Amino acid sequence: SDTQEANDIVTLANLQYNGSTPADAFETKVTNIIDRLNNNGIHINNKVACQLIMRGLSGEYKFLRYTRHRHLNMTVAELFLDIHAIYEEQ
Amino acid sequence: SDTQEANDIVTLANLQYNGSTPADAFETKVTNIIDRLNNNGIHINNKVACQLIMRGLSGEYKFLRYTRHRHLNMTVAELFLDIHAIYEEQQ
């Protein structure tokens, strides 16, 4: 709609995942936001994307934010493989 | 700073102004965020910028979000002139 970008930016900047939602849904939710913002000329590269996903990653997913440092050049895909790996083990 | 963009995006997406802070400070705060994001290759145009400023605009400033509709092509500068106008009169 007229208000889509500002709604994606606010969703992205206030993400909260602890493993209640399926990882499948949480992934395509975040991936779609990054495509929509990118096609609207708001470029959120893998670094800043991953920073925002890992913020408000909580519960048994918290620890991904501490390793994340040794993980520079980490893609969103790579970060979700981890979120998936953790989810399947619950 | 390695973490600047994600910090500006989170600040911008959670703005709250009711007229406690001087408009001067609230303006340069928001303007700086949009420059810093733009110099980091993240362009927030006037439309999306104004939408995010007007969200969490509250108190005697709320009403700017209801008019804002008839105000298409509205710049951030234009929106702050209003915030300033209201602030000088609260004082």
Side-chain angles (χ1 to χ4, degrees):
Chain A
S1 70
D2 210 330
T3 197
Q4 186 65 64
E5 299 106 339
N7 287 329
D8 295 324
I9 287 167
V10 164
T11 294
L12 188 71
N14 292 280
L15 282 164
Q16 295 288 1
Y17 187 80
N18 72 342
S20 314
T21 314
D24 290 344
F26 184 60
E27 173 166 9
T28 68
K29 173 169 172 230
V30 170
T31 320
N32 285 356
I33 285 167
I34 289 155
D35 256 50
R36 281 203 299 273
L37 283 168
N38 225 284
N39 287 233
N40 294 323
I42 300 173
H43 307 143
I44 310 307
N45 63 34
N46 278 294
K47 171 196 131 233
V48 51
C50 284
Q51 280 184 338
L52 288 167
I53 298 164
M54 283 186 295
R55 191 180 145 291
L57 216 49
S58 72
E60 289 193 317
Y61 298 79
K62 282 183 191 305
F63 93 110
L64 283 165
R65 192 164 53 254
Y66 315 153
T67 62
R68 93 178 176 98
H69 277 101
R70 158 186 93 99
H71 305 266
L72 282 159
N73 293 110
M74 187 201 225
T75 71
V76 174
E78 283 170 33
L79 170 55
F80 271 104
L81 282 172
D82 290 345
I83 292 162
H84 280 288
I86 295 167
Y87 182 78
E88 304 292 337
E89 248 286 358
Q90 298 178 353
Chain B
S1 170
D2 211 329
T3 199
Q4 187 65 65
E5 304 103 346
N7 286 329
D8 294 326
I9 285 165
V10 164
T11 295
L12 189 71
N14 292 280
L15 283 164
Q16 295 289 1
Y17 188 78
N18 72 342
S20 317
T21 316
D24 277 8
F26 184 58
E27 173 164 10
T28 68
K29 171 169 180 227
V30 170
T31 322
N32 282 354
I33 284 165
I34 290 158
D35 288 336
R36 283 205 299 270
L37 282 166
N38 191 56
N39 287 236
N40 289 143
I42 302 176
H43 177 70
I44 312 308
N45 67 33
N46 279 296
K47 175 171 137 286
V48 169
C50 283
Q51 279 183 355
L52 289 167
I53 298 164
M54 283 184 301
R55 191 178 148 292
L57 216 49
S58 71
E60 288 199 321
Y61 299 78
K62 280 181 326 187
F63 313 109
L64 283 164
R65 189 164 56 253
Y66 314 154
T67 62
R68 93 92 191 264
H69 276 97
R70 158 189 96 90
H71 305 266
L72 297 166
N73 293 311
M74 187 199 224
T75 70
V76 174
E78 285 174 67
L79 170 54
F80 271 103
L81 281 174
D82 288 348
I83 292 162
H84 280 289
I86 295 168
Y87 183 77
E88 307 290 342
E89 248 288 350
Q90 287 186 342
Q91 304 296 134

